[PDB]
Amino acid sequence: AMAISNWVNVISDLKKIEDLIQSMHIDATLYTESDVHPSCKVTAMKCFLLELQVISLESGDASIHDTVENLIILANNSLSTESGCKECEELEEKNIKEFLQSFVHIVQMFINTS
């Protein structure tokens, strides 16, 4: 075993969730920060994690839920601050494609390992 940021495994779960939702018809719009400021990346990560739970609840699918659960545990293992940041509900609502693309963008900021 060698040491690799947990966030690498988060991207692998996002890829998996994206693949799994492709069959289904999940049509929630979700709060999306597509341009995270480094000074607010914890606040932004927290929003992504919250909204990810909506994808799971609305899917009603065991595998999506397991994969969301695995992601959130990894991410919380990687967290635990910041000021002047937007609340989640101030963010644009975007479709699931755009949401997940932006999720990948920010997970990538945290591999640095920022």
């Binding site: 929630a28 709060y31 929003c47 919250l50 909204e51 739970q53 909506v54 609840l57 609305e58 937007k86 609340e87 989640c88 509900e89 101030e90």
Partner: protein, 81 residues
């Protein structure tokens, strides 16, 4: 095994809903009222489902909480009550 349909949805505080279909398995969505926003992490989806013991159907209770728009909590300050 009849033409099972759901009754009107229950009210959600600070939300309204316009049902396109009352048929079994129909998926509908509450929408937060003007100046309110879906709380992050909560879902506005409600589904018509079957009490498969009694053959009546009901709308699932959404996890939706509509909260005051943070844009306005900050930029349009106001009393409570």
């Amino acid at each position: 095994a009849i033409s099972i349909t759901c009754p009107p949805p229950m009210s959600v505080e600070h939300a309204d809903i316009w049902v396109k279909s009352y048929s079994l398995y129909s998926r509908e969505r509450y929408i937060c009222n003007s100046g309110f926003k879906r709380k992050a992490g909560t879902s506005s989806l409600t589904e018509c489902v079957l009490n498969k013991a009694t053959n009546v159907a009901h709308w699932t209770t959404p996890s939706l909480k509509c909260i005051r728009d943070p844009a306005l909590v900050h930029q349009r300050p106001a009393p409570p009550s």
